[PDB]
Amino acid sequence: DEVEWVVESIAGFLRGPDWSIPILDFVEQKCEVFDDEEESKLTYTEIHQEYKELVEKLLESYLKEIGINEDQFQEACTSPLAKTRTSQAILQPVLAAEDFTIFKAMMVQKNIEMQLQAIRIIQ
Amino acid sequence: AEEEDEVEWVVESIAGFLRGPDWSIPILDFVEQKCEVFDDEEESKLTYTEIHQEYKELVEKLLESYLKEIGINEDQFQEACTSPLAKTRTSQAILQPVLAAEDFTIFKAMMVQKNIEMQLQAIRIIQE
Amino acid sequence: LLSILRKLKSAPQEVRILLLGLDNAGKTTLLKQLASEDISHITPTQGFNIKSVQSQGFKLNVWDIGGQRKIRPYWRSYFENTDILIYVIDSADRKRFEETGQELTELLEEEKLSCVPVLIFANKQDLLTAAPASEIAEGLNLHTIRDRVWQIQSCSALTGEGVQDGMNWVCKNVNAKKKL
Amino acid sequence: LLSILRKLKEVRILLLGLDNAGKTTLLKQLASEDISHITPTQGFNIKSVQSQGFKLNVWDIGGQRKIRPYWRSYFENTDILIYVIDSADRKRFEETGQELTELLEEEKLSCVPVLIFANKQDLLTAAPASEIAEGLNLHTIRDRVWQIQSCSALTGEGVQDGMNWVCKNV
Ligand SMILES: Nc1nc2c(ncn2[C@@H]2O[C@H](COP(=O)(O)OP(=O)(O)NP(=O)(O)O)[C@@H](O)[C@H]2O)c(=O)[nH]1
Ligand SMILES: Nc1nc2c(ncn2[C@@H]2O[C@H](COP(=O)(O)OP(=O)(O)NP(=O)(O)O)[C@@H](O)[C@H]2O)c(=O)[nH]1
Ligand SMILES: [Mg+2]
Ligand SMILES: [Mg+2]
């Protein structure tokens, strides 16, 4: 079954640095404007659109580099193996591309963390 | 209606504490120091439970120190945590390490996520 | 490709609702009511709020966008992937009926919102001055709406009256857009 | 106080039994997940299942002897006990009976309802549902509601049967 390999290929990508480092760099660079408040700012949506383009470029490059066509990708993402071979932690920046609520939580949390670390350093 | 109002103040006070450095930095230290053993896998190790017990003790300690210094008794603290305001005056991000004290599933997720992040930084550093 | 990614979701059960209308119509108050949350410190919305509500088998993700004129050019950033439109009117504010009718008309002509079901909440019916839903619907020529299902529902976001009646209609039409 | 914190937030189910009893297999059945890649549990699994309008938080702890002294660490806040026996492995009936006895005298498990799964009934080596009951002296228990349910985690037989008992007793 070729779908099982594609699922694991995708999971390996999402665990790897080709994906994880550009994602980390975007989140660290852009999260400072994400206040931990219920109401969201109009700028959050523009930044989310930038995040989408990044995620799409990253996935598109990977698929073409490895030799996986879009429908194989859809088949694998639709398989129940996708959810069992990939953890929720690894899926989170993926799901953030589609789900703004997941995106905002990710940015808010990193913003809280970076501020905490700044405090600890001068303390 | 007045001790209703006072309970609202206690809710706000707790939220303030949970955003502040006296709570947040020891929580941050603990998470960063103890996460290395937390693998991103479905099966949990016995050592996760032991580490959770340590986390529970830290959380209890931080909260008791806060309640004592500010002067808030446990009944009041209980009233504030039961209030619906507790969920809406404190963000999900701020509440997470608190809920992690009783909920191991949240705790593991917190620890697993931090380990992933630290392993990633260790890998990037490896050669620039 | 980005739409394929939603299949990675637990139960892709999820409904995206866009909540629009003029400033002061009652959108944020309605949202907080839907979420069973305190409404005591609501202020004019400078950006947007999102609240997720579990109701009758669906996770309804309700997007509450600020209605001040300066924010309306941003409304269109929220059109894509809308399953349901909820449009809120201050029934007591008759001086603004023309302005709100023009916003609704533009929304109903918008390509990115084509075939989307629309619920019109005639809000603030707790006020004695509130115009009846019947009068509002007549004023907005709602009967002329084509190429989508629609509903108008009298409510008060402040008391909660009529809100669940509107949301029951929403839940029956979660798929009206796709089946169309 | 930690117990006060839980009001800022539900049934906890403890799944014990000897190694190779089929505990994890049963759990993945309960969670409707693939079975084919189950290995001996060196620690523990948790999975939450939605049934009967309940949230079932099921803790599957490894049953190897080296893990059993850790069992005590999962006793707190238990609502239901599910005990699994390999019904084909008669030579371990004494061993599993002694663990079950120690469990049933445990303070932290004072009055918890217990379901006993007579697992692996698909195989006809398996002893009748309750050739096993006694030999285990289950009719002698006295401060606790209990049950024994013949079942089969491979294929699914009787699992739902027992799961219905588990939760009329919540
Ligand atoms: N009498 C009455 N007042 C209401 C009702 N709904 C909202 N209001 C009041 O009308 C005002 C506007 O409410 P709000 O929810 O902020 O409106 P909004 O549509 O979100 N405004 P904006 O788009 O600028 O953020 C508030 O004073 C609110 O309490 C209602 O059903 N009845
Ligand atoms: N015939 C049969 N085999 C079963 C049944 N349940 C499990 N098995 C098999 O017995 C073995 C052990 O199952 P497992 O669920 O791992 O047992 P466990 O109780 O979790 N073991 P441990 O506690 O060491 O992790 C596996 O090879 C499994 O396929 C059953 O009902 N019938
Ligand atoms: Mg508003
Ligand atoms: Mg096992």
Numbering used by the authors:
A (entry chain C): 7 to 129
B (entry chain D): 3 to 130
C (entry chain A): 3 to 14, 16 to 183
D (entry chain B): 3 to 11, 17 to 177
Reproduce, without paraphrasing, sentences from the article in which this PDB structure was first reported.
The ciliary protein Arl3 has been shown to act as a specific release factor for myristoylated and farnesylated ciliary cargo molecules by binding to the effectors Unc119 and PDE6δ. Here we describe a newly identified Arl3 binding partner, CCDC104/CFAP36. Biochemical and structural analyses reveal that the protein contains a BART-like domain and is called BARTL1. It recognizes an LLxILxxL motif at the N-terminal amphipathic helix of Arl3, which is crucial for the interaction with the BART-like domain but also for the ciliary localization of Arl3 itself.
Here, we demonstrate by X-ray structure determination that BARTL1 binds Arl3∙GppNHp in a similar fashion to BART complexing Arl2∙GTP (Zhang et al., 2009). The asymmetric unit contained two Arl3∙GppNHp and two BARTL1133 molecules. BARTL1133 displays the same all-helical fold as seen in BART (Zhang et al., 2009). In addition, BARTL1 completely buries the N-terminal helix of Arl3 (area 1). The hydrophobic side of the N-terminal amphipathic helix of Arl3 is buried in a hydrophobic groove formed by helices α3, α4, α4′, and α5 of BARTL1. Alignment of the Arl3 N-terminal sequence of different species shows a conserved LLxILxxL motif. The second interface area is formed by switch I, switch II, and residues of the interswitch toggle of Arl3, and on the BARTL1133 side by the loop connecting α2 and α3 as well as parts of the α3 and α6 helices (area 2). Hydrophobic interactions involving Phe51A and Ile53A of β2, Trp66A of β3, Ile74A, Tyr81A in switch II, and Phe106B of α6, and Leu48B and Thr51B of α3 seem to be important. Since the mutant protein Arl3F51A shows a similar drastic, more than 100-fold loss of affinity, we can conclude that both contact areas make significant contributions to the affinity of the interaction. Therefore, both BART and BARTL1 form a group of Arl2/3 effectors displaying an all-helical BART domain with an unconventional recognition mode involving the binding of the N-terminal helix of Arl2/3 apart from the switches.
